[PDB]
Amino acid sequence: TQFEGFTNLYQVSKTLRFELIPQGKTLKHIQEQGFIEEDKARNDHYKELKPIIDRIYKTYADQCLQLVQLDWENLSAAIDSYRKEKTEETRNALIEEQATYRNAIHDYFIGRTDNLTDAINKRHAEIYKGLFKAELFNGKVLKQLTTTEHENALLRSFDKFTTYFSGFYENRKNVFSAEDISTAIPHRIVQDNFPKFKENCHIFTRLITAVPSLREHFENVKKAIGIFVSTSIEEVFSFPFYNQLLTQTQIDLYNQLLGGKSDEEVIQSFCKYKTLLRNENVLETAEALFNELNSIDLTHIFISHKKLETISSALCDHWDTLRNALYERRISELTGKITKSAKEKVQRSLKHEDINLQEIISAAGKELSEAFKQKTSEILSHAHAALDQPLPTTLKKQEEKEILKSQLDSLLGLYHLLDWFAVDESNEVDPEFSARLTGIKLEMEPSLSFYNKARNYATKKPYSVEKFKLNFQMPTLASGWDVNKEKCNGAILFVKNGLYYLGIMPKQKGRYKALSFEPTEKTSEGFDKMYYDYFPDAAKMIPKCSTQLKAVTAHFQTHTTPILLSNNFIEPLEITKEIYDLNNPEKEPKKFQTAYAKKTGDQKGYREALCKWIDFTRDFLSKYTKTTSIDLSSLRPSSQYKDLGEYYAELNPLLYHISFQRIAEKEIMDAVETGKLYLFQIYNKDFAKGHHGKPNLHTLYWTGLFSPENLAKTSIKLNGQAELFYRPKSRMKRMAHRLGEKMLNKKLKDQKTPIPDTLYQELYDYVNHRLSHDLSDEARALLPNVITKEVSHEIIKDRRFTSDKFFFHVPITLNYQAANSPSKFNQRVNAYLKEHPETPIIGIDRGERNLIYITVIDSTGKILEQRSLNTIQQFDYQKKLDNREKERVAARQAWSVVGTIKDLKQGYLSQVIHEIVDLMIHYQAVVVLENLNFGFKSKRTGIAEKAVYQQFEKMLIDKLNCLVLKDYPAEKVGGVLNPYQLTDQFTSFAKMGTQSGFLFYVPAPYTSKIDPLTGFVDPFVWKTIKNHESRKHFLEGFDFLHYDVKTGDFILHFKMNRNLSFQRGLPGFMPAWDIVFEKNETQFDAKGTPFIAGKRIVPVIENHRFTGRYRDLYPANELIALLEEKGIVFRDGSNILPKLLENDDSHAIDTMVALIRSVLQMRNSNAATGEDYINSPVRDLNGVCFDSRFQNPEWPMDADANGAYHIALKGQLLLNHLKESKDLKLQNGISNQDWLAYIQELRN
DNA sequence: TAGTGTTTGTCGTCTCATCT
RNA sequence: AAUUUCUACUCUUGUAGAUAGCAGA
DNA sequence: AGATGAGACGACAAAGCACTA
Questions:
Q1: How many Å apart are CA A453 and CA A404, to the nearest integer?
Q2: Shortest CA distance to A1214 belongs to which of A894, A939, A926, A1007?
Q3: Quick check: A511 CB within 7 A of strand B?
Q4: Which of A178, A329, A399, A560 is the most buried (most CB within 10 A)?
């Protein structure tokens, strides 16, 4: 099983795009006929027609909801039982009960409810059937039903033209669906409004029982308005009335009984919403609510569990403190022998329940109240200071964009604060507080969309990529390329001197005139027209065109003798009665399908019927008009065919064929001149006259589609259903590099270091002698290093959108001869890997000093190669460009900068995809990524968490589904004819497992802070130790600390069976460890650059601000300094820890604990001095601790090298587990304990 | 009494309940 | 600063890589 | 928690009907 055998496995479809350049006078004819303006009127009638069409849905849905009468008592009991017992049995009971009620509403729409009679029930089915297709435009559905006359007009306007309404049809199915989707009407009734209405009835009866005078008072309010005159106040708070609360007019009356594109558009709309917040006095109402919390009962003010961790991180040291403080106080009030089961019950309770504010204060201390008060006034003051601050006049300057974002941050900050409180009625919420909070919470709700709408207004490019499809009054334009359907579709392809032209023939003067081109000899100069000949699928076409004809069926039903067909046949086709009888039996399993043989066993009759059917099929192929000549004899004899499946799989490729015939140039040019044909050259900058160099992949697909070898034997299919588009020019400010100016390169003379953006713009302005300001000192120093360029020719920025452009979307099917879908791809991958035990591993990790780092390991774990992918094609992404982008973010903190950073990240990951696939193909290795489910990356990494990287994995999977290398020849596997198929088709981010073809996924955590020589990891959770007694207990856990006089290194023997309270719970292998304090000698690497052994970089300066700045540290030096200062002897090699405890000095003990933490900190980095390395605090079997500063080629170079290398080892673990296991299945994830045990057993 | 302009044929994969 | 169009770019009226479009979040 | 199973939807030429002479 060669690695090159992973090709032609399953079909893959791609949609190529091209820009159509009108040829000759075709643009003049199109403008004269007004096809573009009519299509613009069509796409704009879409929005005009959409509300008109919605009248049908609104009316029909409203009419169906008027007859709904249900007993909601069962649904209420399922809601009560789930709130009563929080068990998974009551949850599934409620989920099923909701699905039952949703279907009860759905049966009113489709007409399958027992509550309505057959006459009414069947009338709804006749409407719901044609409710999501072209029957909306017939007026038939409207004839069953309510509309303006403009409706008739505009619905008649898309008759036989419902293509644009495709996705819209799905959006309307989401409205009437019975599934548990929030877009639907049944879901809104069952799971949204009824729990609200059910809660309203409970709030009502509780108030009336406690305060009976409130009953007559509520009744007076209902009578004084005029709503629900036939219904008393007790009945509107009873379940049967909810059946009359299913329509908007009734919902509006119910709610009223309770209640009584441009720059200036964002300023006028926000200031209108902003000035509305003053009149409602929502700030004064909010400031009054949070002031109530100082005196009201806080046992009924509840905090949402979904926000408790966020509040803990915003008001306390960590996210842990609140959940932990509540845990300790609840364990403090348990009864009897507190087992470990009772503790786990308290843990699980804190994950999914709302905590009242009093229990939080009683468990966290008075310092939370001060944090709650300070944070509340801080947010309220910023929102108060932003409502009176006026917006600027325009968004032209960045200083004016900043104040708009600043005021939105204050508005979103208050909106964030209000979502701290639980909204669900499951808790005993305060009467007045919950009403006043819910009021201002809903009045601050539009501020969230205003934040996103405003950020999108200014994080958008100056373009306008909006386009509308062109139909040319052709309902099925470019639907199929077949020559027979050429007249009905009107779309053909040409090719001339290597240039591909698209031609379409519009209707002539409102009528269909067919252009009959005359083929000539190849010696005649002219175009070459594609003669697309197709026959979709024999399995469906042969019965339809031969024996499923209505005339044939009628003749056989009425008459018995065989019939002859002389229509659409070169020679008449003889059809017998028996072939029809076999194709039309009295049982569902026909004798043709394997089901008959499976359920009967009559193999002889099965084979005889199959042979007769195949003979009839061959005769039909011979006798049919279009297939009479297409190489029918190439098939194998009919007798030995096993089943119809293989015969059709063999016959279908032979039916499809593409041929080219020379057509005189004069005829095509005269057709274009007359207006009968619209020529369009297909252009993608790879057909330009200035082109030189390897082309795009889509250009290669297009070229190889029409290659002679592909024409002779199909491998790329030209599918139908093509589309044409048109993009109006969208220019708002035209800038170009005109002749005589001076262009500045965005790179220095080294061609790898990009200029900072602001410095580049300033230098470009200065070079053209058009800068008023003097050059800055840094810019002046940078100027000698930059290279400027003269303008040879004009270069218009964003020239793509300075003129109207046509477009052509054509789909292709790569690997046409393969199967429709992959069949157990992972099993084949595992078989290949098992049969090739020496296949290397590729590990990819996101570093911190580089965006993407990769290391490849062989079967034995040796590093074959470690490379940095932060520089691609002579351009530094991480070390230079992303650093300047981050500096610009820190200097301004705008939105457009963040958007540009995201776009740059996406582009860089695209280049990384190319590099990864290149390395894959070179090494024939299996690539191991990291699954984003487990762990998260620190903010120091260049790549974000799960946002950009997760899309990168999907893009890599898609690339490897059909991988073509442009340097490879077409014939060789990997070229455009035989692409590599190395991964299964992507389905979903959650659905993909630990393996996807040659892509493996291993858990992210525990891959970087690991000693590559020993597998040692820092076991202590330093956040646990806080007090002096904790430090004493931690320090007394270790066995001894004796100073080796001969080597000058301290040895701190530690056993994993100690200090379990401070460990992370991962023993692994190696029960005992020997932590070593390296003597600070100056070691030399391969390059000879000196470095101090044992050097550590620590950020601990102050307890809270322990990350302000990194500090140098050499643990041995200050260890011996402290020992000398404290008057303790250590040169004798005696134990030191008991002496330290005997000294009982808090400063010495705290410094010792800090030293242990620092020495156990392996990854030491300092961006200011360009330092990033890992130092092992323990010795391996060789007797030396790892030090990446030695730059040993066989060991990781730096910390990112460590991460990538250990990801590769995790992938190797998975591969070895596969190899040893008999079954071809990969273990679902690797446990941290299991991985640690494996690596520590391997290293030791 | 023609003639000019949407449905069908069966097979493939998806997609919600479901036996084991 | 020139792109089916997205990123980065310029000795090269273009370069390297990626690119499955339609409708809608 | 992996299955089978009924039902629905994509593929596209050509058969085959809705309007006009």
A1: 12
A2: A926
A3: yes
A4: A178
- Alpha-carbon distance of A414 to A382, in angstroms, equals 9
Joined tokens for residue A976: 């455009």
- Catalytic residues of A, by residue number, are 737, 746, 797, 845, 930, 1163, 1200
3-state SS, one letter per residue, for A786-830: EEEEECCCCEECCHHHCCCEEEEEEEEEECCCCECCCCCHHHHHH
Locate the domains of chain A by residue range.
69-245, 541-643, 742-790, 822-1007+1213-1243, 1028-1195
**CA gap A1116, A558 in Å, rounded:** 105
Give the integer Cα–Cα distance in Å for A750 and A332. Answer: 67
Nearest nucleic acid nucleotide to A15, CA to C1' distance:
C20
Q: Which residues are paired to A663 by β-bridges?
A: A519, A527
Torsion angle of C-alpha atoms A474, A478, A481, A483, degrees rounded to 10: 20
- This entry's atomic model was obtained through cryo-EM
The count of other CB atoms within 10 Å of the CB of residue A1208 is: 30
Which segments of A424-576 does DSSP mark as H helices, in order? Answer: 431-443, 446-458, 486-489, 538-542, 550-558
Q: Report whether A1010 contacts A1206 (CB < 8 A).
A: yes
Distances (CA, A) of A204 to A198, A223, A256, A641: 10, 17, 17, 77
- How long is the CA A167 to C1' D9 vector, in angstroms? 14
DSSP letter at A421 equals B
> In terms of C-beta density within 10 A (0-12 exposed, 13-18 middle, 19 or more buried), how is residue A425 classed?
middle
Taking the C-alpha atoms of residue A775 and residue A772, their distance in angstroms, rounded to an integer, is: 9
C-beta of residue A846 within 8 angstroms of C-beta of residue A751: no
For the CA of A1001 and the C1' of B20, the distance in angstroms is 31
Task: Identify the three-state secondary structure at position A327.
Answer: helix
Encoded tokens for A142: 């409207």
Where in A441-552 does DSSP place strands (E)?
468-469, 492-496, 499-504, 526-533
- C-beta atoms surrounding A991 within 10 Å: 7
What letter does residue A410 receive in the DSSP assignment? H
Rounded CA-CA distance A1180/A1185 in Å is: 6
